[PDB]
Write a protein that binds this ligand. Structure first.
Ligand SMILES: C[C@H]1CCC[C@H](O)CCCCCc2cc(O)cc(O)c2C(=O)O1
Ligand SMILES: C[C@H]1CCC[C@H](O)CCCCCc2cc(O)cc(O)c2C(=O)O1
Lengths: 237, 10, 242, 10
């Protein structure tokens, strides 16, 4: 019954999460520009589908996740999947002010966002989040913490004790990293708050994104994988 | 029956 | 800006003093419920709460230091989240019930009287349960409600100067964090427990955002279905969410 | 001219 996750030290937690990180994937090598709405959405949904497969395998490696029942694992992923894709995108884009690095060969700006109906608004939100992270000098070790927090937190209220203990362990780990980096006590708690508050904006973006995906499903122009269709349906949206 | 089930169990 | 010159005790006092009142519903318990009348009651209440909310916002330290357009944006983004956290707070001592008003307690079964409403009830009830699990204190609640006002729209705001407007908000947010930690330290919590509880509290804001997003889509559909007339204020609020 | 705008003034 007892989870190995709770017995980990902060360094073991950090190391486990870094090791669990999924790879950065590529989009198609076709240099045809500009995009159409259909072709841009085609590339993005294809990429989302491939990242999702790696995400499900990453989640299995987040300490404490596989201690849950299969059904609780499914609920958490269904609730958090787009938030997790988005935080990853924002992290990848951080060193590219003004652009979203969907893939190393698919770096888009907000103007290209306009290629898709209803999309530029989402681009703008993601770009703002990227800029915020850049201005806070977000570190990779903090990023992997925040991403695992999303996985565990987003669905937890729509069910928990194990999950909340694991979340606590990740808070300890985040604070560990900030003290390690030289921040005073007051700076550590201020920074902890700043980071967690961004998670509210990520939830908002995910919810807007889910409405966008639904409309795309309804427009029935862009083929969507069965996996993407099932993740969308979970939101009964 | 969900792709998600298969992926979580594979 | 005196807002940044407040001690933690002073911030708590300011927020506590600013608190709006608990309103009553015009609930006529003799009138048999319809979907139209229940949504009649809820939107009427929301409209009255919104007026007090606007005036409460003026009293949150730092808020009136913002330009008027920035104040409008923040309340436009946060209004339903702020209503919801208040409802959940009122409902905390009523397991399985939502205390919209002292004379209007509804449970999930009554929520089904409106299409698409029961799912939202369930999320609100779950939040209330969480608040109860955590033994949320009134002083913590007013801090969190002011955090929502200042945070929810801070990333959806022109020029390099419009950015300075955002910087003031972040400084006030940091003061409220300092205040939350101060409260927990005063409650005898260890450093580790303080950081853990701060996280627990701020993570609930993500769920409140979610509920507000879902509620906004619900309100939109009610407007389209046109079975209950909507106050002009409520319509403009909805309209700001596009 | 928004209602919210006016109330924030008045
Ligand atoms: C810009 C956003 C639009 C979501 C809505 C879209 O309707 C959802 C489908 C497109 C998902 C694109 C995407 C792929 C990916 O690998 C990582 C991501 O963060 C995103 C993503 O954020 O898509
Ligand atoms: C149950 C929820 C439905 C939102 C969607 C509804 O469609 C939005 C309109 C109904 C608002 C009801 C309400 C009134 C109030 O004073 C405080 C509140 O927290 C709520 C509220 O949370 O309404």
């Amino acid at each position: 019954k007892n989870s190995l996750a709770l017995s980990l030290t902060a360094d073991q937690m950090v190391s486990a999460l870094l090791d669990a990180e999924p790879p950065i994937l590529y989009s198609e090598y076709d240099p045809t520009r500009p995009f159409s709405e259909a072709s841009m959405m085609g590339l993005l949904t294809n990429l989302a589908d491939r990242e999702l497969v790696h995400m499900i395998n990453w989640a299995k490696r987040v300490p404490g996740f596989v201690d849950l029942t299969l059904h609780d694992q499914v609920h958490l992923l269904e609730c958090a999947w787009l938030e997790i894709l988005m935080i990853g995108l924002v992290w990848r884009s951080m060193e590219h002010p003004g652009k979203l690095l969907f893939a190393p060969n698919l770096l888009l700006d907000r103007n290209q966002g306009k290629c898709v109906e209803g999309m530029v608004e989402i681009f703008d939100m993601l770009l703002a989040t990227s800029s915020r992270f850049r201005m806070m000098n977000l570190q990779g070790e903090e990023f992997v913490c925040l991403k695992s927090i999303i996985l565990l937190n987003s669905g937890v209220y729509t069910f928990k004790d194990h999950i909340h203990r694991v979340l606590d362990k990740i808070t300890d780990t985040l604070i560990h990293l900030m003290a390690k980096a030289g921040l005073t006590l007051q700076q550590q708690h201020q920074r902890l708050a700043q980071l967690l508050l961004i998670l509210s904006h990520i939830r908002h973006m995910s919810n807007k994104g889910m409405e966008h995906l639904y409309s795309m499903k309804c427009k029935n122009v862009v083929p969507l994988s069965d996996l993407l269709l099932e993740m969308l349906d979970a939101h009964r949206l | 029956h969900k792709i998600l089930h298969r992926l979580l169990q594979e």
